């Protein structure tokens, strides 16, 4: 679980302080001085200092994972939707490019054949020069010369076509890369725990590292704090054990020694100003 969040300041100063005070070698000069500070203990402020950094780091490491798995997995569901999307337009625009081209392939023929029969119809009108038959063969010109017409356009706009599916493949083929490249991420990322960022797109990269910063800042922060607070009831807390330790005999001062301390102790205890 989380370290930051769960830690008692008090009980760990109080652990750091005991640790301390487990040493049986301290000197009468040194715990004089110590008393006479009204400061953190230097030694043991650094030692819990240490522990909250650790704890901190940690937690940051904690977080970072459960968001960039977060974002792993968005991305990857992300890209197999864009697949399947790409795999069917391509299999669409396979089959139109096909009846696109069969019917091109065969225009010219179309255009040839009506054009052959416009000729004999031009043929057949002069040979008029009733009609009735000259109308029927003028309204029979007309219908080829409309079909001519529209297989010319027919051309030009399966030719369009063609393009704009050419234009498709294109994107589909640069979708395919992009897929391909972040794929290739995942292998170093799936083997060292590194760079997260290159299997995500640029969007995703900063949805990433906008809430992993979001949540460093505010680990740092509550690391500061707790290591403030430590700060604070560091001396109270020391110079309580150090009573303990100096009736406990579990040390090398003789009795002169002792009393000496707690001279100094009970004057820092009486004080008028603090």
């Avoid at 301390?20 to 650094?46: C, M, N, Q, T, V």
């Avoid at 234009?167 to 979708?175: G, L, T, Y």
Wanted: with cysteine; aromatic share 6%; glycine share 2%.
């Amino acid at each position: 679980i989380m370290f930051l969040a769960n830690c008692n300041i008090e009980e760990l100063v109080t652990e750091h302080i005991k640790q301390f005070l487990a040493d049986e070698e301290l000197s009468f000069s040194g715990l004089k001085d110590l008393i006479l500070s009204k400061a953190p203990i230097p030694w043991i402020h650094s030692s819990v200092t240490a522990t909250l950094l650790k704890s901190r780091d940690s937690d940051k490491t904690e977080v970072k994972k459960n968001l960039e798995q977060q974002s792993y997995k968005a991305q990857l569901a992300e890209d197999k939707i864009q697949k399947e999307q790409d795999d069917a337009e391509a299999l669409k625009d396979k089959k139109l490019k096909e009846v696109l081209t069969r019917e091109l392939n065969h225009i010219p023929t179309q255009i040839s054949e009506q054009q052959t029969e416009l000729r004999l119809l031009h043929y057949k009108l002069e040979r008029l020069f009733h009609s009735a038959s000259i109308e029927r063969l003028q309204r029979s010109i007309n219908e080829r010369e409309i079909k001519i017409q529209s297989l010319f356009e027919q051309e030009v706009n399966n030719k369009i076509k063609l393009n704009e599916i050419e234009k498709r493949a294109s994107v589909r083929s640069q979708h395919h890369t992009k897929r391909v490249k972040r794929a290739q991420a995942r292998i170093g990322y799936n083997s060292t725990g590194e760079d997260i960022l290159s299997t995500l797109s640029g969007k995703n990269q900063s949805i990433l590292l906008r809430s992993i910063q979001k949540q460093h800042h505010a680990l740092e922060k509550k690391c500061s704090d707790l290591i403030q607070e430590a700060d604070q009831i560091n001396y109270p807390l020391f110079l309580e054990e150090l009573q303990k330790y100096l009736n406990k005999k579990k040390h090398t001062l003789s009795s002169q020694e002792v009393d000496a301390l707690k001279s100094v102790i009970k004057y820092i205890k009486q004080h008028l100003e603090f």
